[PDB]
Amino acid sequence: DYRTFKLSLLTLAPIHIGNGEKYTSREFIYENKKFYFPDMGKFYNKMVEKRLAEKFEAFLIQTRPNARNNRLISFLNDNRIAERSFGGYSISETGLESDRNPNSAGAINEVNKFIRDAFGNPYIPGSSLKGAIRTILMNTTPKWNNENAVNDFGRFPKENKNLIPWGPKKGKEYDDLFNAIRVSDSKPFDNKRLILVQKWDYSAKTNKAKPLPLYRESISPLTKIEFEITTTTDEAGRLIEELGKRAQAFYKDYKAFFLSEFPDDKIQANLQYPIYLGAGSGAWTKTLFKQADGILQRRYSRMKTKMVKKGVLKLTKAPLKIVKIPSGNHSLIKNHESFYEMGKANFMIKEI
Amino acid sequence: TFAKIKFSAQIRLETGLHIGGSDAFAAIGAIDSPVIKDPITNLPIIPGSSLKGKMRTLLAKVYNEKVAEKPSDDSDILSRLFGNSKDKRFKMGRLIFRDAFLSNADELDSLGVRSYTEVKFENTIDRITAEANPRQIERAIRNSTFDFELIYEITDENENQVEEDFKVIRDGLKLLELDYLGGSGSRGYGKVAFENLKATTVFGNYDVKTLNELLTAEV
Amino acid sequence: SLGVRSYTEVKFENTIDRITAEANPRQIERAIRNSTFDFELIYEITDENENQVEEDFKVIRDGLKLLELDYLGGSGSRGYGKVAFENLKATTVFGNYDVKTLNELLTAEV
Amino acid sequence: MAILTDENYVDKAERAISLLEKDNKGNYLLTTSQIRKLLSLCSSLYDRSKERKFDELINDVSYLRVQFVYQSGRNSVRVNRQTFFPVKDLVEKGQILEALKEIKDRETLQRFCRYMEALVAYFKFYGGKD
Amino acid sequence: MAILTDENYVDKAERAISLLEKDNKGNYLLTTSQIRKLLSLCSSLYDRSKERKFDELINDVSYLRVQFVYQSGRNSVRVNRQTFFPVKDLVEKGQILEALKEIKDRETLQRFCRYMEALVAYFKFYGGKD
Amino acid sequence: MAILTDENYVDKAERAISLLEKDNKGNYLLTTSQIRKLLSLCSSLYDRSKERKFDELINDVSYLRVQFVYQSGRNSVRVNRQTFFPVKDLVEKGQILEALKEIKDRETLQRFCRYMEALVAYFKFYGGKD
């Protein structure tokens, strides 16, 4: 009575899923064309055997570094440390990680961490992919993407969480649809698939991309990640077997709604069924944009960073990659300024 | 012909498990969903009530031939194995489940972990306002293994039913593998696997060679 | 010394309705897992027992083993009441009787 | 001479957190999210002090100390063009590092972890936010 | 002067429970599940005070005070667009902290535990929920 | 004015028992197992009142009152989709709570204990199950 599907995810762009934590510049070393993230405990243990525990503690305690005492490489240089075996991991320098020089200005002060397990290995949680799938399914079902999805009985509008029934009811048959759809997480991938992209915003009014101080740990483009999706009812089986051709319908609506207002070279092409995963893909990829139009922008009308019209396009920077497919040679992006549509990925779902 | 056969296995998690308890052993500054823990060691456990209840509910969809509104309305093949408080024939079942405790804490330490429960950060995103409400959920570590012990008793009431009860036990364990042990498993929690699943006659005289063959081959 | 604050825990459980899937909670009291209790069992030998002492000893060992393989009273089909008999030995507290072979069998068999 | 004893750590935590910096509205600048990792590490160290010997827990205390220094140096809250550092304020006003220097066996370690228990308890008591 | 005496603590609980915050429907805001840990700790302390002297019960009393001040600020219920602290209200109206500060010997400790028993008894007598 | 005198407490128990609420089947909702602890405490208090002076019995009377109100608020039976409190009803109709406040010496204590014995006797006489 259970159906099992295999969802293969191929990232077409950097994908970041955070845990709320951030590396500070006193925690990583930019050298030898790489970002080295040591283990703080191992670093401190090696620094108590060199009689520099008090110096390192004064370095970390200092709440107001001026411009250069905020970097760990300054501590490693002043105090004459040559050892680099502190555990941790490394990220290969891309070049398009900061619009300025990472070793000259303030530059990368904070890095948003990717989600990891207790062993320090990155992975994609099943809750994240389930949320993306739920957005795709809710946007392409006319009985959920209607005006009844907005709870207007309040100070400001919000979502009608009771539109898709969930939970037990007194004396009624159990009617939770999304309990039947069970998305598992991934087996952890390696830190060799991680890059240090930066947030760029492309405005349809300014007609240019503006960089922002928001650096993330992201999966590199062309990464293969496998998920298992289990279905326990029949309706959810139809929904999941229709995950493609619903992702295509959602992307068609999204392109006709938002992506059509931007230059074609800034918009990526799809090899498989499209999806948007993780942080940075935008507000319209995470909402019912047909019903959230108007409400979402007025939520930010009284902030300094005002949402104007339908917002800006999120375009990170990451190295250009060609792929070999049956059609020949395919460029992941159509522009020469190395602009990936942040959060974009493709998938194929089979019926294992 | 009384005998007792112990199915011993290793419940190795394939994902973090959140069986969930109260705040009796919760930290004094933790806004969390705590897991059920040993009172002394403060380690995560898999209570036998969770295993028994989940296995019974899963086997109720395969071995009933009639939808049951209650565990008392269960079929005979499951009532004689799990018990039935409204049946003098099956009031005491033939299966004893046992609490499972962490059995590879040393291996987890050698793998480089600082605690045997992690805290996963989730949120719910409003689909009209794009407003995120976060939560923290405690989970047991993914590569944890728990000692699983299940005792099956054989009396004269098991004269020609042991080969069927063995099959039901195997099917229940397999269904538990294609399901999740108690938790938020619809978002990818509580996936488990049964390793080194073997049956040992711990009391009396009984031959478990064939059963052990289907245990270690079919699994 | 292990820092326990109570000698009884409260185990929290719930029952899920088969049709409506409603969870009804329930808490019960349990003794702490690694608690140890002093077990004493007196056995009396008279003129009537002299030819049945070994059978009685075998039955006592089998009963202790069966209790170890079962649960002591409670909701033990759901994982309660599993016990072990540690430092299990028999000594003659009255009269004269040799418990050397009985002690060897008790240590080897439990 | 020890700053933490079994007869004063709760009152010490009382005074330490009653002196924490406050906004002009009266709310505490410190939040539980800024000290969540430190509290988790203290809880794990207390749990592990019961079983294992103190010589095994020699790296855990050092990791806890480096975490305390890192969190005190990194956490900043900016209100009304003024930047405060609530975790560093808590560390200096509670003498966390000095108390960590006086950890030499199971008793002192458990006393320090109970002191952190008292600190967060009374922080929540006087309107601390999550 | 002591606030808990053998003649007044039951009437003190009588007076304290009647003043607890209520909803507009008239039911209480505090529940037994919020004070379950505090009741368990008081019961364990009272049981263990019979068999052993007050000299080495100091850690249990200090932890009891820490848990009281923690559960006061931890438990918050939001009803009708207004935050309430029911355990904090009970602690401030029953003078739990001031009665704890008066504990110096076995007699006062047992009096405090009996006062806590009287408080929960009268809370349940007046329609308090679990 | 004393509600319990040496001339009418048996009749008061009789009327109280006759006024106790029943089920649809005429069965008493109160059971002896619900008041077993109360009866044991009353018997111990009556036994101790013969030799010990009322000075050391005040704590026992206070705990007895605490147990009475706790059992009034704790025991509840739900039948025919309606909930009832048998111990609370017994306490109200039997007029027990304020009969406890007039216990000022040995005579009043023994009067109350004999009143409780009469209540039990007439409760069992009218079909009160165990």
CB B149 within 8 A of CB B8: yes
Return the residue of A nearest to B144 by Cα: A118
Give the distance from residue A140's alpha carbon to the nearest chain D alpha carbon, in angstroms. Answer: 37
3 state DSSP class of C11: strand
Nearest to A42 by CA among A11, A6, A86, A2: A86
Tokens of D83: 């930047």
Is B125 near chain A, with CB under 8 Å? yes
What dihedral do alpha carbons F85, F87, F88, F90 form, nearest 10°?
120
CB D115 within 8 A of CB D99: yes
What dihedral do alpha carbons B18, B24, B26, B28 form, nearest 10°?
160
CB A174 within 8 A of CB A233: no
Q: How far apart are the first and last CA of chain D?
A: 35
Strand-strand pairing, E83-84 and A209-216: unpaired
Question: At what angle are helices F106-125 and F36-49 packed, to 10 degrees?
Answer: 140
Tokens of A210: 């503006």
DSSP letters, B14-39, are SS-------GGG--TT--S-PPPB-T
d(CA F57, CA F45): 8
Nearest to B120 by CA among F34, A116, D102: A116
What dihedral do alpha carbons D13, D14, D19, D24 form, nearest 10°?
120
Look at chain B and count its residues.
219
Chain B contact set for D43 (CB, 8 A): 27-28, 30
Residue B140 to residues A28, B14, B42, B123, C48: CA-CA distances in angstroms? 29, 11, 12, 19, 59
Residue with tokens 């605690």: B115
What dihedral do alpha carbons E9, E10, E13, E15 form, nearest 10°?
-100
The data reach a resolution, in angstroms, of 2.7
Element (H, E) at A228: strand A224-231
CB B132 within 8 A of CB B126: yes
Element (H, E) at E97: helix E96-101
d(CA B44, CA B117): 7
Delimit the domains of chain B by residue range: 1-219
d(CA D48, CA D61): 11
Look at chain A and count its residues.
352
Does B129 contact A292 at a Cβ distance shorter than 8 Å? yes
Look at chain F and count its residues.
130
In chain A, which among 230-259 make CB contacts under 8 A with chain B?
Answer: 230
Tokens of C60: 């006592």
d(CA A251, CA A245): 10
Chain E neighbours (≥3 Cβ pairs under 8 A) are B, C, D, F
What dihedral do alpha carbons A203, A209, A215, A217 form, nearest 10°?
90
Tokens of A216: 């993330």
Chain B contact set for C1 (CB, 8 A): none
Q: How far apart are the first and last CA of chain F?
A: 35
What dihedral do alpha carbons C104, C110, B104, D105 form, nearest 10°?
-70
Pinpoint the alpha helices (H) of chain B: 48-59, 76-82, 105-110, 162-177, 209-217
Nearest to B13 by CA among B190, B131, B158, B200: B190
Residue A169 to residues A108, A176, A179: CA-CA distances in angstroms? 51, 10, 14
Task: Give strand pairing partners of E78.
Answer: E83
Tokens of C108: 């080897």
Other beta carbons within 10 Å of C52: 11
CB A215 within 8 A of CB A98: yes
Tokens of E74: 């931890």
Is C12 near chain B, with CB under 8 Å? yes
d(CA D107, CA D88): 26
Chain B contact set for D121 (CB, 8 A): 28-29
d(CA A127, CA C44): 66
Tokens of D58: 């020699």
Go through C21-44 and write b for each residue having 16 or more CB atoms within 10 A of its CB, e for each that does not: bbeeeeeeeeeeeeeeeeeeeeee
Return the residue of C nearest to B83 by Cα: C77
Suggest the residue from A113, A117, A290 to mutate for an interface test with chain B (most B CBs closer than 10 A). A117
d(CA A346, CA A276): 8
Does B96 contact C80 at a Cβ distance shorter than 8 Å? no
CB B123 within 8 A of CB B134: yes
What dihedral do alpha carbons A12, A14, A15, A17 form, nearest 10°?
170
Number of H helices, E strands in chain B: 5, 8
DSSP letters, E71-86, are HHHH--EE-SS-EE-H
Element (H, E) at B121: strand B117-125
At C32, the amino acid letter reads: I
Nearest to E119 by CA among E16, E8, E4, E47: E16
d(CA C100, CA A76): 71
d(CA A137, CA A239): 8
d(CA A207, CA A190): 37
Is E70 near chain B, with CB under 8 Å? yes
Residue A113 to residues A116, A186, A306: CA-CA distances in angstroms? 9, 18, 27
